[PDB]
Amino acid sequence: EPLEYYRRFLKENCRPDGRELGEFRTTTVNIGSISTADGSALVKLGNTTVICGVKAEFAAPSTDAPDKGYVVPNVDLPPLCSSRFRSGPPGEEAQVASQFIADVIENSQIIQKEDLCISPGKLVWVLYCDLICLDYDGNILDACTFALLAALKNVQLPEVTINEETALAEVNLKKKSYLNIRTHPVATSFAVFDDTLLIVDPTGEEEHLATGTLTIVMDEEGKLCCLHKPGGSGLTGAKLQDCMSRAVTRHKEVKKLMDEVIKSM
Amino acid sequence: GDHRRIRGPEESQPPQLYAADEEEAPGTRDPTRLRPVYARAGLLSQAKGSAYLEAGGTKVLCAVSGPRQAPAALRGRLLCDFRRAPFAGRRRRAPPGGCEERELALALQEALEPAVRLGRYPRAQLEVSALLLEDGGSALAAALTAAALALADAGVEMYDLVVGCGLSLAPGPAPTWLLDPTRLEEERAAAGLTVALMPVLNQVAGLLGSGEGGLTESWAEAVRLGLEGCQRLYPVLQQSLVRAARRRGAAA
């Protein structure tokens, strides 16, 4: 009798865990936990958990845009996250999340691909940002985006040079250089029950028994990078402006958190 | 081109191979030494049992998706998926793998089947899923230990725990067996070895090895040394499990 048990709390303006329908759960990060990787970031929202490792490599660009350093995300929902996933190739949710992360990276323009070209037409960086879920208690997109941004700030790259005599490039793993990122896109999630009831940061069950879901990415300068609205019972702008406000608030909060962290190092 | 992942570049080589330097060598140390170990069981929630182990730069998870319906024929099964995260190691490898992941998976299965008693889990397959977040030395042994912890945590029956230990060989003129090494001591090495046993009943469960060289007596000394290391390591894991059980008692 799950749904009924849940409507009782919903109408008491609460949830069975102790959250007031509009607040998230304990959000925490950990930077630089990993040496083998250029950038590393652990994120966890109470029970939900995500980890991003960003490696850096060389590669030859395309012919349409030689001055473009690729940024390739891939999300991994291994079977140890939840039992709804099975050992094998990637399912559907992983792939959807991957395309979401890529759309974000491409639209928010947090990073200029041009800032990754060493020798146009010949070399350019490729940033393989690999995200891994470890507890899919719910709201995996927020965690994925936040971990991506955190690690992608942690990343400091080496410096390379070109020798015309050898016609090859050399690296200097001693000196390095951080990675400039302009926008700080944060993602805020929503679960829409029958008609008008929007809860924020929905956990697992709340997403299992929901009529629809929503996600909204809100850049710092009062703009949006993505309004992910896969199906749902419907919405009018009045049930949407409020979500945008709450998204701005969450942006503020998590950016303050991330600043405190990068400064506590 | 894979149509289940994002369109990246065809090929991509790392920058290190384009470096110019003689990497630093470790030097000297106490051969019979062990790294500081942090082992905790009960980390993950959505899993019946989970465990986490850190030893130096080594960082490994293991989860146990429990019995899932699927005498000597109605005998349980356990299928293990070892998997190193693409952001571990100097080099990057696509997530799939298909060369060494499966070898180490076979190793885990061959080292766990003995300890676990599967007569009490018939018509069932236990999905063990290991994950290697960072490689910093003895990896397969950490994975064995973590899978053992995760199983013992989920409450599957057993006969004893599994303790692993990795060894390497110093290529110096006086080659000594180096215990619980680092990725540097392991890539600048001649031979490598891995033992795994059940210390109460003193029985190996799965071992492995390889060598630029060696000889019977040397391998035997290596074996006994790894056994002693595993013995000296066991109590940590004991205390970890006790601690997790106490936390459960606390929750209710």
Partner: peptide, 11 residues
């Protein structure tokens, strides 16, 4: 062997 603290999963 002595122990350490979780660089990644502290409690």
């Amino acid at each position: 062997p002595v122990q350490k603290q979780a660089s990644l999963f502290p409690d």
